[PDB]
Design a protein around this ligand. Structure first.
Ligand SMILES: Cc1cc(NC(=O)c2cccc(-n3cc(NC(=O)Nc4ccc(F)cc4)cn3)c2)ccn1
Length: 342
């Protein structure tokens, strides 16, 4: 008799619309609390994400509210499209949880990274990541936090970006909850608070590509100290021109780290990491290495744009012809609720 029904999945209760049946947890990855389900109405398999009391703090609130707003005003095949948004709660007073529905994909990008991929597959994932990022950039969306965990793929190698990243005109805080923030794919400008342009997300596409070839996180670490050491340890200390654009403090710290000449890209990503059996693969390896060498550049002023990357011989083959201000818990609960209810 209720339009909704509850089911305990993993550890989390899922009060969902009776149309969604046979709810199996994804776990990895997922991300947050994400389910697989069969939509009776649409006759297709969907993925259901539960946002638990998202208005509980500024961090959770700003992200949920901005992603909901942006999921509506964005339309691309490599960007998250919502099939449904709902709340089981009947009033603004009763409101607790938000449920976002999208099509079911088959894996996240970390899983795909672990696999031995060919140049056909590899350049197709990379073309799509850049297509998505180009679309976000045109909508005035500079991600800054692109990572494989928030990227999903289908068996046919079709890719989608699930989030809209770092809140422009913010202003991040702490988390009283136990969850890891993946910083490994963030651009040096993010690592060193610098001010950015569109190609801040290219660094991210270079870390991912690098990991597809190496099968190891390129610049790991506990924090930006550990991390920055690995960036300069491999690509070498940035040129004096880069230092000039830094804040006086950042500049002082950066200039005072032991200097490194840096490894060359054939030594960073040797021939052994790539298929070599044919001439085709021999050519595709040097083309692959060239793209990386242009994406993994500390100084943004020198690092490759999204448009130039799509016209790179490795990628180009796939070409086919309000309101970041502070609010309260009550203020946020309303902004979010009247966006669910529209
Ligand atoms: C045919 C089929 C496919 C299955 N898929 C999986 O097991 C699987 C594994 C990892 C990731 C995903 N996947 C995850 C999402 N969505 C999200 O992670 N987050 C998200 C969800 C909804 C939103 F509105 C926004 C973000 C999609 N696919 C599915 C399982 C069984 N059969």
């Amino acid at each position: 008799d209720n339009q909704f029904y509850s089911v305990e999945v993993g550890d989390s209760t899922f009060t969902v619309l009776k149309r969604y049946q046979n709810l199996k947890p994804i776990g990895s990855g997922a991300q947050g609390i994400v389910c697989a389900a069969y939509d009776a109405v649409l006759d297709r398999n969907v993925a259901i994400k539960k946002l638990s009391r998202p208005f509980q703090n500024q961090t959770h609130a700003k992200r949920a509210y901005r992603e909901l707003v942006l999921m509506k005003c964005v339309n691309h095949k490599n960007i998250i499209s919502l099939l449904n948004v709902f709340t089981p709660q009947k009033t603004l007073e009763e409101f607790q949880d938000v449920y976002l529905v999208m099509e079911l994909m088959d894996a996240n990008l970390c899983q795909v990274i672990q696999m031995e991929l060919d140049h056909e597959r590899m350049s197709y994932l990379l073309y799509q990541m850049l297509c998505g990022i180009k679309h976000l950039h045109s909508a005035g969306i500079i991600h800054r936090d692109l990572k494989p965990s928030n990227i999903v793929v289908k068996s046919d190698c079709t890719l989608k970006i699930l989030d809209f990243g770092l809140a422009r005109t913010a202003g991040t805080s702490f988390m009283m909850t136990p969850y890891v923030v993946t910083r490994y794919y963030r651009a040096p400008e993010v690592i060193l608070g610098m001010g950015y342009k569109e190609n801040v997300d290219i660094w991210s596409v270079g870390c991912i590509m690098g990991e597809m070839v190496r099968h190891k996180i390129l610049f790991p670490g506990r924090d930006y100290i550990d991390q920055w050491n690995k960036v300069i340890e491999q690509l070498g200390t940035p040129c004096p021109e880069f230092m000039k654009k830094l804040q006086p403090t950042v500049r002082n710290y950066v200039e005072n780290r032991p200097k490194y000449a840096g490894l060359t890209f054939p030594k960073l990503f040797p021939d052994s990491l790539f298929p070599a059996d044919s001439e085709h693969n021999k050519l595709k390896a040097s083309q692959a290495r060239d793209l990386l060498s242009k994406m993994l550049v500390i100084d943004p002023a020198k690092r490759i744009s999204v448009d130039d990357a799509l016209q790179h011989p490795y990628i180009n083959v796939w070409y086919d012809p309000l309101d970041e201000r502070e609010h309260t818990i009550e203020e946020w609960k309303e902004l979010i609720y009247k966006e669910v209810m529209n």
